[PDB]
Each structure stands twice: as C-alpha cells, then as structure tokens.
C-alpha cells in the first residue's frame, strides 16, 4: 500500500513508502505479450480530481486501492488541433481525446474516428475483433456518447446519436445518403461481444435505409441476435456473450445516475453555507448495475476467449458532475471508479498476462483551495474523512457549464508493457502501445 | 527524445514514444550510493504550469530538454497540518511544504524547520555538512524566503526575515530574548559552502545581542570569513567555497528580475485583449547570473569535495508569477529553470553518481482553458510557438493574490535511487529518500 504509514504529526508518519523500491520497480518490468487489455478512462478525471476525491473519501494520507495501486506512471498529453489550420487546439474534447487513443492520430474537438479530413481509422476495439478476441465496450454514460462512441462509430460530429441528427449535422454519414450511419448504427454494425452503459432513448428512433428501414434500433438490434438486458438482475442472468450472441445492455434513458448525492456549489458557498457530507443517492435504484458490477460480468463473459480481450471500462460523470459544478457528485464518481478499477486488478494479478492501464481523456474545472477563499465563481466546503474541511472552487465560466482544462496528466499502469506509460507521453502513444502489447 | 514524430496530423505523427521502453527502464534503475543530489525546485510548478510553459516556448508536441528529460516520474502529495488539531491542512504554503522534503516531517503553514509542537528537526543540509559533504543553497527568490531558507533556519513564522520583524513576530526566536535569531541570522549561523540568490536588504539590519551587536549583517558575514559576491563578473572570479571561506551571492535587493514581460491577466482579457506575444526584460543583463549560471558555477565549487555535496536550486518566480496573474512572466521563470535543469542533467550524466530531481513545493492557480471561455477571474490569450492562440485563467481569488491549490503533482528524478519517485508518494518520502541515497 501507499497510505500515511503512522501519525502525521510525527516525523516519518506521512511516508507512503516502507523501504526501498528499486528491486519491487525491476519486478514491476515485463516484456512479454499481454494476453488481455483493460483500460478504465475516469472522464475529466486529473490530478486534481483525483486529489480531491481521495482527501474526502480516503484521508490526505489515504489510499486509492484501485487507482493508486497501479506501479508504473507518467504524465500525457492530450492536445487536439484545429480542423482548418491543423494547428494544436491545446483544450481537448472527449471526442477528439478517445479518437486519439483508439485509432492513434490526433483530430479535432468533436469528431469521432475520423482525422481532420473526415477520414476514417480504424480502431484498437475493431482490430482486436479482427484477430480474433473477445472485445468489450462499458460505460456509465449514454453508449452514443463520444467515449464509448469512439471505440464503435466513424462520424464528423459526436451529436450524431441516431439517424435523426446525422440527416441533418453529417450528411456525409447519413445511411439514406451512402454513409455508414449513425453512431446507433454504427455500434450495432461493429457487434462487440459486451456493451454495457445507458443511451436507451435513441434506440427508439427508425432507420431511414437498408436492411432494417422503418424498424426501430431496438427492432434491429433484437432481428440481428442481440441479447437485450435492461437492469441488475438481467445481467446477472447473462451466462455466455459472442459473436452469435452479442449481449448488449441499456441501464437508462440517457445517462446511469450517479451513487452520491450533494447540493451545487454556488458564489461563496464555502463562507455563506454550511460544510457538506456526501450522501449516497436516493434516485438510484438498487436494480441499476454498480460500473464494478459491470465490469465484473464483462470480465467473466469475455475471459471465456482463450486468445484474449479487450476491454475499455468508463466512469463518465466525474466529468459531467465536474461541468455541474457538483462536488459529491464528482467525487463519488470517482470513488465509484476505483471500485471498478479494483475488480481489474484482482483479475490482473490472478491471471497473469493482463495489461491494466487507468488515465482520463482530459483534466477538469475543480480546484482544492484554502478553507477561507473568496473566489469569483462557484464554491463549497466539505467535511472529509479526517474530520477536516476541504474546500473545492469552479473558476472558468461564467455560464453554467464549468470546462475542460488543458493539463498533462497521470496514466498508470501495471503488467505487461506497462513500462511505456512511464515519464512523458502522448495520449496517441497508448493506441501504439496497446496495439504492440497484443501484437496486433 | 520526448517531441511528437512528425506531422501532428497524421496518424502516429504526434507520439513521442519511438519503440518500447521495458529495456531502457531497467537501465534507469540502480541501487548504488549517490555521491551527490541536485534538488530543483519549482515553487507552484504543478502539471498545470509545465504543460502551459510547455505549449507557449516549445510548441504541444514540444519537450523541455531538461524538466521533461528525466526518465523515473511519479505524482506526490504536499498537504500541510493545521497547527491546533494535528488535522490535514490541503492547502500548503511554501514554508511547511519545504520543511516536509528537507526534514521529513510535516507541519503547520508558515513554520519553518519545526513541527506543530515548534521542536527543531535537523535539515538535509545540516546532515549533509555534519556527515563531511559540500552544501550549496540556490535560489532566484530573496534568500530569506521560506523555499531557501527552510534548509538552514529554525523559526516559527516565515515572516521572520531579520531582526526587526522577528522580534515583532517570532518573539521566542529573538536574538535578544535568547533564541537562535532570524531567518539571515540563522543562514550565517548554517554556513553552506556555497549561498546564491537575492535578499540583499536585509543585511542592512544591525543585531541586537551577540557578538556581532551594533554591526550589519553584511559586516557580520564578512567579519565571519565569507566571500561576498554581487554581480556575475564577481562570481565567476571565485575559484574555491569550503568551510574556511564559504560563498555568499546576493545578487539582487529582493527577489531577483525575471526574464520575460508581458501585461497582468485581466477580466475577459481574452476577449476584449488582443493576445500577447511575451518579450525579454531589459533588467537582465549580462551582469545579473542567470538560475542556469548560479547552477553551474555551484557544481563547480561544490564537486571539489571528494566525499559528495548536496545541492538545492529554487526557481522561485514561477510561484510569484503565478500570484500576480502575469502567463509571460511565469512562463519565462518555467523555461529559466528548464535550463537549469539541463546543466544539473548534463554535469549527472558524465558524473554517473549523481541523483537529480525535478519537482514542485505545490500545485497553483493557472489553467489552461478555450480560447472563446468567458470565466468570472482574470484571462490572457497568448501567441505560442505554435503559431495558434492559449488562454490561461486565474479564477480562486477575488483579491489581487491568486492562490495555491492542493492538486497531486509529478515529481521526476534521474540517476542512483530515483526509483524512489515513481508511483504515488508523499512530499515528506523525499526527506527520507535522499538521506538513504547518500548514506547518511
Ligand atoms: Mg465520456
Ligand atoms: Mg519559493
Ligand atoms: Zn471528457
Ligand atoms: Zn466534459
Ligand atoms: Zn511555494
Ligand atoms: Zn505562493
């Protein structure tokens, strides 16, 4: 472990580390094939999101036993460009940042598997596919949204959900006008073994074209073999996922709620309101799947492949609740992560031949500031672990969307391979890295 | 090499990674002594800062040959202590957070060299002299300040610069009350064979007991057998610094100038502003030395030691930069200390024995955000290497000092025992990681 060894307040007490770690680093190296892939993106989680949600939840001196448990880490960068100039857009998307891990070039804020030319590239999901593994695509966000989306769909716009807005924002992608279709469409065509997340509500809208035109892409997804499940108990239930029968899983309408509860930071929140204590949330249904419990069944079912998988696990409301200027909802997002990421590394280690890798697409609004700040946005205090206050600030907007920042930040990593995420990096090096790690 | 390949656009274009990195790894790593450590410090240089020096001097798919070049990297923790309950403060200042790495010890904000009981706890620097090794002590900032002056003086608020303020605010440490004197007292007491910075007012003040009473502290330091330096043809004169006739630079009033201008960031500044374009300071001149002339000339002197030295470089004008809402002016105290960090890198590599380090005190306000963001704080447009515009925010304090944040923030190392940065780590591992490298 890496927590506070003893008393904080006595020297040596706040060291993480026992003794020297030069002989555990060296074991930590190896060069051989990875059999299996997991790489778990916590959406707009940076260092300072991480820094955060363990003060409040584990204590300063805590411990992340997922997300801080991985040996090997460095620092990336995840720049777009513009679309006309080609030029660094030093303030990334999650579109433009997923296409960069997933098909290793660098395009511009809003598109999806596609370069600045809106020319398609293939992606590390579809080339494991192509050789023959198992692959899986898991989400707590909508499955149309841009970093699951990115995995399964080729498209000029990420606001390209289902028919009805590709008609109109990429024509050139419109199945009535020669294209591959919408992002919907596109992620039924691209069949993963497991896909898990919400986004139900476009799956209501009717195809305009081919084989299925006028049916639903629910109708479709049922015609073409899929194995629809809808909540815990359904998964559950779920004993086998292949290619003749592909399970695919739509846990809401739009996005899967989040596990805690808290109000919204406002203009000096942490003077003139009271500290808060995150709560878990009462409009989250128990028959709603936990993102670990997710994982968990997706790692069982796709394990059964003896060649191998990969597997992308998301936690995509750090970054929602982070735009909502939501702390509680942020940070149990992120502790809601680490769960997920723990089941990896259990996995990981029992096997032996698996590469677990755990970053964020972009960094974030949310700052920890001193207990009596006057700041000009949106503020709260809270009462963490340690019986202390934490103050959290959202500085950048005027509107009521707090943004995305431009910072490097930590990737980690453990076996095989996982010596190239060590020093500077860019977000493009690790679709070359996964791709070497299972020689595809 | 860490710069993108190429063509940015183009797939594979902006990874920095050339091949696999597991080989090279295990040739970074070695458990043999170090003969000597080279600290740099970057006061409020968070991932934040390197990645906005980084975009504006060297380009997004730039590298920094020195910060960026030192292969080991992980992120460490810097949380200070509330003096009364012993609780975590999350927000540091620089005074606890270098008392942390040079004592190992944690404590309240602004003590300096004790814990929150106001117990001495020997410095590093201290160790290092006791154990036989050259001690060096470098900083752009006034030399009383808490980053320099945590190595060598012992006294309960940082304020305590000389004489008149410690007998207002650090009763207890007076001189004349029977305590140990003021922070200038205290550095001509530690008496580090080499001492290069600002701070020359100070030594104006005469003592008030002792046996320099009635004298300047300037006249005590020549009284004691030091060589004054104050401009860089005098420093580059000297030939030797030891015991018997220890250096002593003061080479400004205050804090030393920086190197670039450019104007304060300012409510939608980059909207209502043209983008700035930074441009140098015609207060350097070739008779100020520069971090990287400092550095050099300190290896120099310290390296005559057969045993091994010790040596901390501060640049401190990122932190004070930083406050002041100026991205030209923090930007060029970025690439100021870049190159002293290549000549710490440099000297290493042909040595084979040395362990160099290149961290931050704590994280800080700047972000890299859109260039169309309407925030509530202070903004900046900036044309970069790149030939495209950066906007950097200042958004956590409505008075005129931004403020620092509690974010994680990498820490790099090179050489003997920097296996011991990598992974997660506390500020206080590093007091305990550099004592074990050098034996003592
Ligand atoms: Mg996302
Ligand atoms: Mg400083
Ligand atoms: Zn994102
Ligand atoms: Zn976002
Ligand atoms: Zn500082
Ligand atoms: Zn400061």
Redesign the interface.
Same mark, same amino acid.
């Given at each position: 472990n890496?927590a $506070?060894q003893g008393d904080?307040?006595?020297?040596? *007490?706040?060291?993480?580390?026992t003794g !020297?770690?030069?002989?555990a680093?060296?074991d930590s190296?190896?060069?051989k094939p990875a059999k299996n892939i997991i790489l778990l993106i916590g959406d707009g989680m940076?260092?300072?999101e991480?820094? $955060?949600a363990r003060?409040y939840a584990e204590?300063? *001196?805590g411990?992340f036993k997922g997300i !801080?448990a991985?040996?090997?880490?460095?620092?990336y960068?995840h720049?777009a460009?513009?679309k006309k100039?080609?030029?660094?857009?030093?303030?990334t998307d999650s579109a433009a940042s997923a296409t $960069?891990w997933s098909?290793?070039?660098?395009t511009y804020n809003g598109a999806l598997g596609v370069?600045?030319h809106e020319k398609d590239?293939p992606t590390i999901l579809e080339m494991a596919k192509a050789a023959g593994l198992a692959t899986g695509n898991v989400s707590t966000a909508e499955l149309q949204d841009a970093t699951p989306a990115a995995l399964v769909a080729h498209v000029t716009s990420r606001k390209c959900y289902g028919p009805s807005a590709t008609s109109e924002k990429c024509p050139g992608n419109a199945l009535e006008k020669g294209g591959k279709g919408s992002i919907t469409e596109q992620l039924l065509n691209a069949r993963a073994d497991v896909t898990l997340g919400g986004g139900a509500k476009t799956f209501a809208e009717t195809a305009t074209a081919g084989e299925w035109q006028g049916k639903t892409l629910r109708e479709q997804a049922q015609a073409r073999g899929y194995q629809l499940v809808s909540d815990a108990a359904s998964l559950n239930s779920v004993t086998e996922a292949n290619q003749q029968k592909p399970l695919l899983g739509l846990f809401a309408d739009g996005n899967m709620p989040v596990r805690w509860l808290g109000p919204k930071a406002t203009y000096h929140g942490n003077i003139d309101k009271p500290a808060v204590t995150c709560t878990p949330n009462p409009q989250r249904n128990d028959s709603v799947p936990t993102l670990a419990q997710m994982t968990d069944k997706a790692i069982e079912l796709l394990s059964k492949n003896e060649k191998g998988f990969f597997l992308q696990v998301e936690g995509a409301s750090i970054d929602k609740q982070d735009h909502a200027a939501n702390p509680c909802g942020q940070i149990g997002e992120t502790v809601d992560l680490d769960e997920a990421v723990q089941r990896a590394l259990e996995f990981a280690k029992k096997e032996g031949n698996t590469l677990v890798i755990v970053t964020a697409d972009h960094?974030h609004?949310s700052?920890?500031?001193?207990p009596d700040?006057?700041?000009?946005?949106l503020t709260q205090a809270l009462n963490?672990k340690?019986?202390?206050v934490?103050?959290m600030?959202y500085?950048?907007?005027?509107?009521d969307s707090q943004?995305?920042?431009?910072?490097?930040?930590?990737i980690?990593a453990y076996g095989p391979?996982a010596?190239?995420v060590?020093?500077?990096?860019?977000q493009?090096?690790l679709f070359?890295?996964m791709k070497?790690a299972l020689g595809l």
């Open positions: 890496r $506070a904080i307040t006595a020297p040596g *007490g706040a060291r993480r580390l !020297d770690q030069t002989a680093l060296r190296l190896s060069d940076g260092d300072s991480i820094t $955060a003060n204590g300063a *001196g411990f !801080d991985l040996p090997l880490t460095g620092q960068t720049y460009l513009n100039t080609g030029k660094p857009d030093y303030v $960069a098909t290793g070039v660098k370069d600045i590239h960094a609004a700052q920890i500031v001193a700040t006057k700041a000009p946005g963490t340690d019986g202390a934490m103050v600030s500085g950048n907007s005027e509107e943004e995305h920042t431009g910072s490097q930040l930590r980690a391979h010596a190239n060590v020093g500077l990096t860019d493009t090096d070359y890295t070497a």
